[PDB]
Design a protein around this nucleic acid. Structure first.
Length: 159
RNA sequence: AUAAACCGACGGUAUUGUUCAGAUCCUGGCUUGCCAACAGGAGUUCCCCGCGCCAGCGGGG
């Protein structure tokens, strides 16, 4: 797996839809500022997508505390309507995390809407590793819908 | 097609050389920006799709 720092020329970075194409020329990305973090199965440089820096497969361990950040699209369905309640969001997060890890503490930041509409929510907090390999697959696959719209990328950090 | 008509005012040419504006000079004394305050409310998201008990859950844009 490859962890990267990618810059996508402002000309390209006009709308959300244009974003995944530039990096394509699946994988996972999260917008930092267009500044972007790129998690890819292959090593990532186009004139439309310059690469500042790029390879990692973590050892990890069981029962280990880690900081985490994740943009996601928590929604219901009766159209994919957003989950606005703080309780629903935190419950949503632990659910989709399954048995990979438990949510010790988390702050759900109801991000500003992006453009059909996409209501993103950034979950920040700390986890402890319950199922180590199941956590990796969750990272390498992403979490939630609108995964190509910057959502779904789970970032992890020690303490 | 008129005291009109036709119809040059023309030619040559350094304004030059010299020259401190200069000495003296606090802008200065006085002066709360101050009193009140949950960031909370609100599930619209327009598609394709897969699996349902039809309630709702997923993967691709």
């Amino acid at each position: 797996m490859y962890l990267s720092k990618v810059i996508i020329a402002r000309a390209w970075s006009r709308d959300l839809y244009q974003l995944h194409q530039g990096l394509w020329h699946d994988f996972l990305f999260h917008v930092e500022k267009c500044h972007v973090l790129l998690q890819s199965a292959q090593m990532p440089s186009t004139a439309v997508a310059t690469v500042i820096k790029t390879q990692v497969e973590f050892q990890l361990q069981v029962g280990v505390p880690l900081y985490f950040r994740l943009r996601a699209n928590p929604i219901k369905t009766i159209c994919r309507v957003p989950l606005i309640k703080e309780a629903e969001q935190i419950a949503w997060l632990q659910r989709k995390l399954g048995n990979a890890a438990r949510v010790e503490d988390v702050h759900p930041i109801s991000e500003r809407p992006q453009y059909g509409k996409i209501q993103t929510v950034c979950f920040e907090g700390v986890l402890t590793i319950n199922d180590a390999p199941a956590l990796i697959d969750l990272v390498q696959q992403g979490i939630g819908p609108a995964k190509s719209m910057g959502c779904g990328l789970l970032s992890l950090a020690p303490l």
